[PDB]
Amino acid sequence: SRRRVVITGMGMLSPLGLDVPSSWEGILAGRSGIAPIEHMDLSAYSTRFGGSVKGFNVEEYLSAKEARKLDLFIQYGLAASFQAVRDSGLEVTDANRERIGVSMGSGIGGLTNIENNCRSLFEQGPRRISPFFVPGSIINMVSGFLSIHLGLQGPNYALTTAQTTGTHSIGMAARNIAYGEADVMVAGGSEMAACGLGLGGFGAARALSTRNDEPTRASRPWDRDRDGFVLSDGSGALVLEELEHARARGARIYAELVGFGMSGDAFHMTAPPEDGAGAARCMKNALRDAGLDPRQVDYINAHGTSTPAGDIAEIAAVKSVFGEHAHALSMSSTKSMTGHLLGAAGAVEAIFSVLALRDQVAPPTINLDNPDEGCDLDLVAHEAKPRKIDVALSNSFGFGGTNGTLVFRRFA
Template identity: 55%
Template structure:
């Protein structure tokens, strides 16, 4: 029996560059930065005082007012992006098909703002004042849970928590669910809302963040010699995935095919990548094998590209290990240069970028690339978007704990 093909038929995003796919994509192509001073809270005493925040989000556009205060922002973001994606796909979820429509949305950190608020209540007002909604608002699986409730999707419903690789694992696992016939449609991706005092100070303490407080918009500079850490972002990226048979039967639009997926583990360190990028390289090679493609078939890589000194050099080494001489013919760019690192949501937004790149034949730039690093010597599409045909795109997501995920997208 032939393996079922899985197609992308809908996209939804909430990002620091815009709260719709169209607004986000135009911002990316124009090379705009979504980074600025933190406004969610007073960060004046923090070593890093800027981030890439979602701006102007109105949750009541996507859910009832009475529900908003009982749903953490990370799940609100997931609901918004999922509803966008389903509308974009023209998908009707009905009692007749609901059991064949599933949800797989992850979050690396979950409801951290709820945790912080309720901890303050506990300290200042005592245990009797804790909200009964505390646990349901905090737990990471609630993005999937709330989306399934909001949409009436009764098929496979689960979640993934693998730090910065979360959304890519979610999309890959959702593809596998469709391939084996357990669902016809999966709503998949990631969501994150961790620009909170403890979220930011935790990464500050780990010395993972850029400290360019005098020039925030130029702080995220993947592969640049002077990179000094990542910029925190937030938002959601959700895809509607369908079996080819289901999509063609209803005449759905198709962005691209999810052609391959693989995941590996570094078994090395809780935050640092394995030297030489061995785990990332294996993930890329295995994803290409899953897609039945050769390295020379790939036109574009949407890099993990965090703007940290270790990641960018290691990822570059991993790409060269897998692609050999072809690495120097690839276009490689980092979405994070404009929207920061969306943590568990990053892979979802970047998967959407790959689909749009294939559709529109435009590769967005890596902005703030000014000073080449000898250890990062590939074509990073510096500073200006490029029109180019892209038939095959690859997306890397590499998470704390040594979690590596790679997705391969192909023109359908």
């Protein structure tokens, strides 16, 4: 047997805003957070735009001294974690601190501060490198720093499963609570890969939209004119909590995390299989974990990256899993608005899945002007769609063919 897991706190930085309510307001209004990148010369790059976090003030969270030590991806993670802990109302004590852990991940982590330290290293050699360089750059430091600032003494770790990180972090945090290893986890991921190596690195694989003339139109999942994903920055954090623990302290509960699914495609390094066999197993695995028949799913937050091979794989996967129900469920890609936050994607997208339940509204897929061949599902093109949502899936399909699925349900 098993303990039930509920969402009691949520926090976020996105290209749409500096917290959940402002980001969600963007999602439902079909607003784009995509813009040419400022403060960085991208002249020599085939992509010149993305989702940046706009107007971020780290000193709302940290002294300027402790922020100088930390890559932007750590800052962003800590912001979402702090938002989420505050949102939860949870009081940490000597009595419960050993039962409260953190699992915040990143796809690449401290790329920006690595890039800035290479400069120092080749020009001037090793003596300029900062003392805080290693601890200020490694992925596990969001979990490290948050545990120290808050006195969290419970399972302390970080996933890095590329674009699946946020989904795997939340999912395996849930498992820690379900199986009695913790009563509370702060879980999700953060990403800031908007640096020469990120844009350059993805640019070299021609994985990125090159639609420099219309950055708001670049992210157009399931549309025949899409030409790869948009690179976006930010963070999601949820406070996961055991149900009796949450009820006892009178917490506001958003939704129940009822299921977690993992799988491997075991196919290709970057490209899913045409038929989404992997994503289909992962989804089947998640619904079984939740004890739910596929018919009961109402909303799917797709991966929906706006890559040609990835979007079509997800359609195949859903038709396969849901058969006669695949047209009844609504499925949108919020990346149409936010772009791809990589290891943070599944975190912000689990929050969007939780709010979709709170507000009975399916977020739009904007720019879905001309569906491709076989993209005839309910993809919620252009505008939000109010509707019944008892169960919501969030999907993440990553490099290595690492799949993750979270199943949320209305709580009462």
